[PDB]
Design a protein around this ligand. Structure first.
Ligand code: BCL
Ligand code: BCL
Ligand code: BCL
Ligand code: BCL
Ligand code: BCL
Ligand code: BCL
Ligand code: BCL
Ligand SMILES: CC(C)=C/C=C/C(C)=C/C=C/C(C)=C/C=C/C(=C/C=C/C=C(C)/C=C/C=C(C)/C=C/C=C(\C)CCCC(C)(C)O[C@@H]1O[C@H](CO)[C@@H](O)[C@H](O)[C@H]1O)CO
Ligand SMILES: CC(C)=C/C=C/C(C)=C/C=C/C(C)=C/C=C/C(=C/C=C/C=C(C)/C=C/C=C(C)/C=C/C=C(\C)CCCC(C)(C)O[C@@H]1O[C@H](CO)[C@@H](O)[C@H](O)[C@H]1O)CO
Ligand SMILES: CC(C)=C/C=C/C(C)=C/C=C/C(C)=C/C=C/C(=C/C=C/C=C(C)/C=C/C=C(C)/C=C/C=C(\C)CCCC(C)(C)O[C@@H]1O[C@H](CO)[C@@H](O)[C@H](O)[C@H]1O)CO
Lengths: 40, 46, 46, 40, 46, 40
């Protein structure tokens, strides 16, 4: 590919940034389930 | 968040799969670590 | 700081992900080290 | 890509340089949290 | 110092990140070495 | 990229060469801090 317009960039990143939170959230569940059933 | 203009500098067609890959790699590493410096991980698999 | 003109010499589209990658790599290394030359890191995971 | 104009270079680097400090700062917190709860 | 004309032979856009990378690599190596042939480095992390 | 004119080469290298000294200097501090607090 190529770079993006400043507009389509910012609009991609919107998605990159929910991706992440979806991750994070699921992580949290994990880490807690972990934390929970675990010597840690 | 504040950083979306990076795709104006870096071709998401290479850069995204980059990020997502390094995540996948990182998670295996972190597993690998914990697996080899606890007993209780490995214990789990038994 | 004083060094921004480097992107006039080096295509940030290759150079930035370079920097950011070497950071990510470096942090895993430094973890890896500390993990394998203390007890207290590993202790932590137990 | 390609290189940049001297103007758009310096303007990129502005961002590279907050990136870094954001890092640094968070590092500091880390190193202190570390330092704190730790034999180091 | 005397050597600047090298960029007339070698495209700083590949050559600079080369140098800077080999520095970064070298420093990790030298750390790695010292870490694994003293006690006092590792001692430090405890 | 491409190679450089003999003029823009020499002018790049000016920067390569402060980079280095900045490094060196900081190294020196390191090596001394080292030297100082250390069995070496
Ligand atoms: C080690 C301590 C605990 C434990 C505690 C935790 C904690 C705490 C966490 C996890 C997390 C996860 N663990 Mg664990 N977990 C344990 C044991 C296991 C076991 C096992 C059988 O041993 C397995 C299989 C898993 C599995 C998992 C995942 C479901 C999840 C991480 C996802 C990840 O990012 O994948 C990525 C890696 C891959 C290999 C998946 C790749 C699949 C896709 C198809 C490929 C992506 C493509 C990519 C390369 C790029 C493509 C880009 C596009 C083309 C543009 N766990 C032990 C018992 N686990 C993490 C999680 O919840 O994440 C939020 C987390 O925080
Ligand atoms: C070892 C001693 C202590 C401790 C002390 C410290 C100290 C001290 C510090 C950290 C730091 C960090 N530690 Mg630690 N920490 C410990 C144990 C852990 C554990 C664990 C389960 O063992 C984890 C998961 C972490 C996690 C972390 C991170 C949150 C953070 C470093 C971030 C980094 O740069 O990531 C980068 C690496 C990755 C794998 C992340 C990659 C994710 C993204 C999506 C990919 C980036 C993409 C890149 C490749 C290029 C793309 C460019 C664009 C496309 C253009 N620590 C132990 C207990 N920790 C550092 C921090 O605070 O940083 C400021 C720090 O200073
Ligand atoms: C081993 C003996 C002593 C000690 C004695 C010394 C001495 C003596 C020195 C150092 C030096 C350094 N040490 Mg030490 N130090 C010790 C323990 C540590 C610990 C640790 C937690 O164990 C850490 C994290 C450090 C950290 C450091 C660095 C701050 C510094 C080297 C910088 C370097 O070149 O990075 C580069 C490597 C990286 C991973 C950084 C990369 C970051 C950037 C973003 C990437 C650059 C990009 C590159 C790949 C190319 C891009 C080019 C452009 C795109 C064009 N030390 C022990 C206790 N240390 C050296 C220093 O002062 O240097 C002058 C030095 O001389
Ligand atoms: C027994 C359970 C184990 C354990 C087992 C595992 C396993 C297994 C996994 C994790 C996972 C993670 N663990 Mg853990 N984990 C443990 C305890 C910890 C500890 C701790 C010190 O207590 C820490 C700090 C962490 C931290 C983390 C995360 C770094 C990571 C999940 C990412 C996430 O969702 O981010 C969500 C993203 C965010 C919300 C981003 C926010 C960005 C902010 C705002 C910062 C800006 C960026 C900044 C400037 C840095 C620039 C980075 C550049 C690329 C260099 N865990 C214990 C010890 N953990 C998972 C993982 O690492 O996935 C790869 C995983 O698979
Ligand atoms: C600095 C403050 C700015 C900001 C500045 C930057 C900068 C600068 C950069 C990013 C970068 C990123 N940011 Mg941002 N960013 C911000 C806000 C966010 C938010 C948000 C607030 O919701 C999200 C989802 C993201 C998402 C992202 C990722 C897509 C990307 C790399 C993440 C990563 O590696 O972090 C690494 C993770 C951390 C250092 C923190 C570790 C995760 C947290 C701390 C703990 C996870 C909890 C875990 C589940 C449980 C742990 C339990 C144990 C007790 C510890 N940013 C704010 C507005 N952002 C990077 C980028 O785009 O490069 C490609 C980058 O360089
Ligand atoms: C138990 C706790 C452990 C430990 C665990 C960890 C872990 C875990 C991590 C760190 C991290 C870091 N640690 Mg530590 N750390 C410890 C103690 C130390 C000691 C010490 C000797 O006491 C040192 C020197 C450091 C130093 C560092 C940094 C190099 C690094 C965070 C980068 C940062 O935010 O920069 C912010 C950036 C700056 C502000 C840049 C300033 C630039 C200046 C002006 C210099 C110009 C550049 C110069 C010329 C060099 C050119 C470089 C070229 C590329 C070659 N830590 C103890 C022993 N530390 C993190 C890391 O390395 O991330 C990858 C990380 O994940
Ligand atoms: C406990 C402390 C440890 C130690 C821990 C570390 C750590 C940790 C690091 C160093 C670092 C360095 N150490 Mg030490 N170091 C120790 C003791 C020494 C000893 C010694 C024999 O006593 C030596 C010779 C060195 C030498 C060096 C440097 C090579 C390097 C810093 C580079 C620098 O700033 O250059 C500045 C640059 C110059 C001014 C250049 C001058 C150029 C001249 C004019 C020559 C022309 C070039 C010539 C023709 C060669 C061509 C090269 C081609 C590419 C092949 N240290 C002790 C044993 N040291 C750092 C390092 O290597 O960084 C990667 C680093 O991270
Ligand atoms: C050894 C040891 C102990 C190690 C431990 C140490 C360390 C350092 C551990 C480290 C832990 C860390 C830091 C972990 C990291 C966690 C992080 C995890 C991140 C996760 C991110 C995820 C899952 C991201 C997901 C994102 C996704 C799926 C993206 C989706 C986006 C799309 C589908 C885009 C949609 C297209 C759109 C609508 C925008 O539209 C399109 O725009 C284009 C231009 O913009 C146009 O050309 C095109 O015509 C148009 O169609 C954050 O980064
Ligand atoms: C084994 C062992 C013991 C090892 C230990 C040893 C060693 C050596 C350890 C080493 C430790 C060290 C040195 C660690 C390093 C730490 C450092 C960490 C650095 C972190 C940096 C980070 C997180 C950087 C983040 C930067 C980011 C996210 C950048 C953002 C920038 C953007 C989004 C750009 C915005 C675009 C902009 C607005 C400028 O605009 C655009 O400009 C272009 C041209 O310029 C135009 O063409 C385009 O049309 C336009 O849209 C520093 O480097
Ligand atoms: C196992 C074991 C024991 C191992 C130990 C052994 C060994 C061998 C150990 C080795 C140790 C050694 C030798 C270590 C090495 C140390 C060294 C370290 C070096 C460090 C160097 C550094 C940090 C360099 C930094 C340089 C930087 C940041 C460069 C900056 C330059 C710029 C920003 C350029 C500015 C652009 C400019 C103004 C010139 O302008 C531009 O010019 C172009 C053409 O010229 C034009 O086309 C463009 O339009 C215009 O804008 C030296 O090299």
């Amino acid at each position: 590919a190529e770079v993006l317009t400043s507009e389509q960039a910012e609009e991609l990143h919107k998605h990159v940034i929910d991706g992440t939170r979806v991750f994070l959230v699921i992580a949290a569940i994990a880490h807690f389930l972990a934390f929970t059933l675990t010597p840690w | 968040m504040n950083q979306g203009k990076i795709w104006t500098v870096v071709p998401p067609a290479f850069g995204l799969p980059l990020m997502l890959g390094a995540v996948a790699i990182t998670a295996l590493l972190v597993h690998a670590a914990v697996l080899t410096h606890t007993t209780w991980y490995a214990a789990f698999l038994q």
